[PDB]
Write an enzyme that holds these catalytic residues in place. Structure first.
Site, PDB file in Angstrom:
ATOM      1  N   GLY A  12       0.838  -1.181   0.000  1.00 20.62           N
ATOM      2  CA  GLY A  12       0.000   0.000   0.000  1.00 20.62           C
ATOM      3  C   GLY A  12       0.875   1.234   0.000  1.00 20.62           C
ATOM      4  O   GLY A  12       2.092   1.140  -0.173  1.00 20.62           O
ATOM      5  N   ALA A  13       0.264   2.394   0.193  1.00 21.01           N
ATOM      6  CA  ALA A  13       1.015   3.636   0.246  1.00 21.01           C
ATOM      7  C   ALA A  13       1.836   3.705   1.522  1.00 21.01           C
ATOM      8  O   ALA A  13       3.049   3.908   1.483  1.00 21.01           O
ATOM      9  CB  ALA A  13       0.081   4.817   0.168  1.00 21.01           C
ATOM     10  N   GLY A  15       2.161   1.299   3.856  1.00 21.96           N
ATOM     11  CA  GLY A  15       2.651   0.026   4.353  1.00 21.96           C
ATOM     12  C   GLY A  15       2.425  -1.169   3.444  1.00 21.96           C
ATOM     13  O   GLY A  15       2.267  -1.030   2.232  1.00 21.96           O
ATOM     14  N   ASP A 113     -13.779   4.085  -2.937  1.00 21.70           N
ATOM     15  CA  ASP A 113     -12.730   3.632  -3.877  1.00 21.70           C
ATOM     16  C   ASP A 113     -12.981   2.196  -4.321  1.00 21.70           C
ATOM     17  O   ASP A 113     -12.090   1.356  -4.295  1.00 21.70           O
ATOM     18  CB  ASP A 113     -11.326   3.767  -3.263  1.00 21.70           C
ATOM     19  CG  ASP A 113     -10.197   3.752  -4.318  1.00 21.70           C
ATOM     20  OD1 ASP A 113     -10.457   4.011  -5.519  1.00 21.70           O
ATOM     21  OD2 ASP A 113      -9.037   3.488  -3.939  1.00 21.70           O
TER      22      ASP A 113
END
Ligand SMILES: NC[C@@H]1CN(c2ncnc3[nH]c4cnccc4c23)CCO1
Length: 253
Positions: A12-13, A15, A113
């Protein structure tokens, strides 16, 4: 109590997500790592539905979220590029997506999202909505609050989110569900973004359904798409009316 970190599942961004296996029970869970999320935990605590990734808890040390492990991977990987998937599989996945989205909206949460990367599959290919890092409360004490922050992923966002200062949360998630259905049935995304400068979106509004991806889609599911991918969020079909749709209710396989 002791868990072995077996492998990385995704990045992810802020982690990564790791597969963790219980040393005693051999139960698998996914652990989302975030080196400082507060709202994501709060929202996750509210969630309890068979088409939403379960939340088992968290330990702060760097924040560690304990979440349902989905061994079937992501919906993205069941979509063959330029082809899609068989219509009966797409319909079943879409039924399960609506069930998850109905639940969330029912408790006043919008995901914001929805896309195939975020729709995971368990060992029996049951769809699970995951990643509530962008999610927010849009109804509280039975009072709706309009949204104004732009977020999500351009190919999946509703046109009002780009054009209006304020917008209702629910029609936005409905729209992204329609983009997901298009992807499942055509194996391609119809546009970079739903703006008047985007030629493919203009073509859609002018109903050139003889072009891709629309020509790959049978007339029944395409008629449902005509009701979802409506520019005016106020005129856009709602979920209760999607449940009444002819293709939605068509026996398949
Ligand atoms: N894009 C998906 C890949 C693999 N993925 C997952 N893989 C397997 N099980 C999971 N359970 C989860 C609960 N919450 C968030 C993610 C998962 C997760 C992590 C993200 O990157």
């Amino acid at each position: 109590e002791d868990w072995d970190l077996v492998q990385t599942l995704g990045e992810g961004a802020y982690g990564e997500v790791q597969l963790a296996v219980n040393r005693v029970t051999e139960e698998a869970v996914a652990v989302k790592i975030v080196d400082m999320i507060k709202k994501e935990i709060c929202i996750n605590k509210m969630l309890n539905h068979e088409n939403v990734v379960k939340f088992y808890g968290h330990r702060r040390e760097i924040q560690y979220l304990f979440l349902e492990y989905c061994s079937g991977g992501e919906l993205f990987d069941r979509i063959e590029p330029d082809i899609g998937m068989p219509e009966p599989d797409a319909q079943r996945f879409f039924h399960q997506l609506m069930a998850g989205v109905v639940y969330l909206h029912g408790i006043g949460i919008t995901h914001r999202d929805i896309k195939p990367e975020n729709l995971l599959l368990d060992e029996r290919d049951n769809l699970k909505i995951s990643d509530f890092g962008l999610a927010t409360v849009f109804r509280y004490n039975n009072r709706e609050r309009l949204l104004n922050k732009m977020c999500g992923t351009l190919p999946y966002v509703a046109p009002e989110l780009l054009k209006r200062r304020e917008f209702h949360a629910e029609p936005v998630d409905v729209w992204s569900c329609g983009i997901v259905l298009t992807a499942m049935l055509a194996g391609e995304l119809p546009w970079d973004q739903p703006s008047d400068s985007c030629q493919e979106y203009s073509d859609w509004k002018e109903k050139k359904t003889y072009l891709n991806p629309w020509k790959k889609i049978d007339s029944a599911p395409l008629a449902l798409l005509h009701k979802i991918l409506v520019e005016n969020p106020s005129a856009r079909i709602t979920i209760p009316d999607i449940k009444k749709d002819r293709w939605y209710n068509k026996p398949l396989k």
